[PDB]
Amino acid sequence: MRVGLVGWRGMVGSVLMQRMVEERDFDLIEPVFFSTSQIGVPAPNFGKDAGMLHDAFDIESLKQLDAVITCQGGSYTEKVYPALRQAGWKGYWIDAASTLRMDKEAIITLDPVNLKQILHGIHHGTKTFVGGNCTVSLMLMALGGLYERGLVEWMSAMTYQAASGAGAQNMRELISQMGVINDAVSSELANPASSILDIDKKVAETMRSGSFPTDNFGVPLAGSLIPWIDVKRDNGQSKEEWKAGVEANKILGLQDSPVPIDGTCVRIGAMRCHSQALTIKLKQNIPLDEIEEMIATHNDWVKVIPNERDITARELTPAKVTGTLSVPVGRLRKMAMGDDFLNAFTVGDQLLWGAAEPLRRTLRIILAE
């Protein structure tokens, strides 16, 4: 099967390859790599020889591919996806960008959760599959048990989003900022007896000095947070706080009867793991004993973390999760407001499940058919 990869050198594109190499995905497909900067040059060899690089903007070149997995982003998809369809391409388009997520002809992929919805589409046309928003898919990879059973009346989400979400450049800024802040009070920290409030004062001035590296975020992220992600919408939500409902239901396939979901999406200085604090409103007071099972059983990556202090500290943090496909969820307890009020805190790598993993898995699926 002739599959082209686009935007594969990018940040997501890279995790995508690492994983395809790990799962030997390259053993069931004839790969063709795409670039926009220097066609003709040899192509990467992750294991097998894949010839040269091809023109990612060449509609004619793509027409000869059965599959296209692009992590090249929206601006690319907007031009090339259309051009490719109208030119009669009936092949499979596996995209990471949000562009086609809300299109009728496109299925948002997250099999662990919606394998059903995917297979229907596979046999019944559907050639355009898009991955879901980093926040939503990690959320579902944790609360998959409850949702799949329509057990949820509504959910309130307050997030702790990693910088990776914004782009590679932002991660760099985050660590530069952390650097710039230590640099300001480096010595004073050494002297175990300096003035704590003086250390603070400086740190504050620094983050405040225009010379603080904020070209990518606009304001400081390290040592602060930004209670707004993406563009403002008509009502009060941001497109980030919005992709929540619309996209979540689409997957759950329940748009004319959708579970209410809203909350505040905040950026915190974490590298690549999104974290969420959910106020889950269930419909029927269910024993926590059973919520854990439904949850724990939904898929092989969600991991329930005993609501015990010490272990939660080791286990439910960006620190532990980053880089892994594990999706911890803990602090599971009924809340001060009724036994149909379930509290839950989850951590998840945004580059894997929140972006790349679904894509490669989807391929393996479409193949098993």
UniProtKB/Swiss-Prot annotation:
Top-level taxon of the source organism: Bacteria
UniProt KW keywords: Amino-acid biosynthesis, Diaminopimelate biosynthesis, Lysine biosynthesis, Methionine biosynthesis, NADP, Oxidoreductase, Threonine biosynthesis
CDD domains assigned to the protein according to its UniProt record, in alphabetical order: ASADH_C_bac_like, VcASADH1_like_N
Binding site for NADP(+): R9, G10, M11, V12, T36, S37, Q72, S164, G165, P192, Q350
Active site positions: C134, H274
Pathway: Amino-acid biosynthesis; L-lysine biosynthesis via DAP pathway; (S)-tetrahydrodipicolinate from L-aspartate: step 2/4; Amino-acid biosynthesis; L-methionine biosynthesis via de novo pathway; L-homoserine from L-aspartate: step 2/3; Amino-acid biosynthesis; L-threonine biosynthesis; L-threonine from L-aspartate: step 2/5
Modified residues (S-cysteinyl cysteine): C134
E.C. no: 1.2.1.11
Keyword Secreted: no
Family matches, as SUPFAM superfamilies: Glyceraldehyde-3-phosphate dehydrogenase-like, C-terminal domain, NAD(P)-binding Rossmann-fold domains
Residues annotated as binding phosphate: R101, K243
Regulation: Inhibited by S-methyl-L-cysteine sulfoxide in vitro, via the formation of a covalently bound cysteine at the active site Cys-134.
Keyword Cell membrane: no
Catalytic activity: L-aspartate 4-semialdehyde + phosphate + NADP(+) = 4-phospho-L-aspartate + NADPH + H(+)
Amino acids binding substrate: Q161, E240, R267
InterPro entries named among the record's database cross-references: Asp-semialdehyde_DH_CS, Asp_ADH_gamma-type, Asp_semialdehyde_DH, NAD(P)-bd_dom_sf, Semialdehyde_DH_NAD-bd, Semialdhyde_DH_dimer_dom
Described purpose of this protein according to its UniProt entry: Catalyzes the NADPH-dependent formation of L-aspartate-semialdehyde (L-ASA) by the reductive dephosphorylation of L-aspartyl-4-phosphate.
PANTHER family: ASPARTATE-SEMIALDEHYDE DEHYDROGENASE, DEHYDROGENASE, PUTATIVE-RELATED
Record text on subunit structure and interactions: Homodimer.
Recorded family membership: Belongs to the aspartate-semialdehyde dehydrogenase family.
Full protein name: Aspartate-semialdehyde dehydrogenase 1
Organism, scientific name: Vibrio cholerae serotype O1 (strain ATCC 39315 / El Tor Inaba N16961)
